[model samples]
Target: VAVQLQYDPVYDNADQSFGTVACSDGPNGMLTKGYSTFGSVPSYVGAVDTITGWNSESCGTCYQITWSGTGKTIHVVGVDVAGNGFNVGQRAMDDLTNGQAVALGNIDVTATLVDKSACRL
Candidate 1:
């Protein structure tokens, strides 16, 4: 199946640039301060929400919440690059101020719910 990933803006060595998946303004706009968006917002994780393909430092992995116009079925994974306090990524910082910006990483992601709706959007 095909799924979409989301994240906040950051200095990506992979792209040698900044980018975002679920952000409103996108990556470049957020990176250069031309624009900004929340990296990680809070969601009510329910019971039986299973997560997979977690390739990051996230413990309670969950995808940030956003709605597609047509309500596409999307796979989600939670990531926390918030190393301590200082190394707060742009999205993390934005999450603190505005709201959470769903984050994405290097490779493409595919996830599914093993249990039930144990997790939030």
Candidate 2:
């Protein structure tokens, strides 16, 4: 029983709040900062911004996401806040072979809330 999560990126012209800590560069580089390779971006080094369910207060909180298909694990940082839905960056999603990144899609994965104390500031 894993949660199916989708790779949500801030639109190119979307609001700034939807962007993450690395958003200053723009949506294309927000997640990995041009590092499209998988695992190249370290765990707890990114952000997810949402409106209500999770917000600025949750910033710095870490979550362990396990992709169902490949069983790849990614640790994400909560650095931004949006109004809805779970979103992840392209590179933040598991990278596949042939230099292919995971399509902007949903994956059946498990999400575990790591202890806040363990999260990096």
Candidate 3:
């Protein structure tokens, strides 16, 4: 289904291997305090939205995200949460669009749940 795509710098940290974000370990946005998300925030993952594509149960799953029209796709793992879109690590987004401007907010894309191996980056 058609979805929105976004990114966060916190998702690209050395601790998380530069392509991950904190899972629902505690409060949202707690990565600033050096407090890890306490879950498997694997590289090539995204903080999916609880609204539709992802939920607390979605942790550890894989998703194949394709930008509309471009046909370019990026397979991402489910790690955390967002409001409505798939918020991926900088590297994941870079893999998707090759350094597209994050300022381009909410780029149109489609998400599909895929096999875990499909998301291998």
| Best candidate according to TM-score | 3
Question: What C-alpha lDDT values do all the predictions have?
Answer: 0.29, 0.46, 0.61
Candidate 1 per-residue lDDT, tens place, 38-114, comes to 22323322111221222222323444333232232232323223322112233432333243233323212233533
Candidate rank order under TM-score: 3, 2, 1
lDDT tens per residue, model 2, 1-121: 4554555443211343323343323333334344332223344344444323332445545677666567677666554443333355655664411112455365555666686444432
Candidate 2's C-alpha runs over 4 A off are 9-55, 82-85, 96-104, 116-120
Cα displacement (Å) at residue 64, model 2: 0.7
Tell me how candidate 1 scores on lDDT: 0.29
Error of 1 at 86 (Å): 21
Model 3 stretches with alpha carbons more than 4 Å out: 17-42, 50-55
Highest lDDT model number: 3
Q: Which of 2 and 3 is the better model by TM-score? A: 3
Candidate 3, residues 8-56: lDDT per residue as tens digits? 7656654553123444333333233223542233346567775232224
Q: What TM-score, computed on C-alpha atoms, does each candidate reach?
A: 0.21, 0.51, 0.68
Q: Can you tell me which runs of candidate 1 are displaced by over 4 Å?
A: 1-68, 81-121
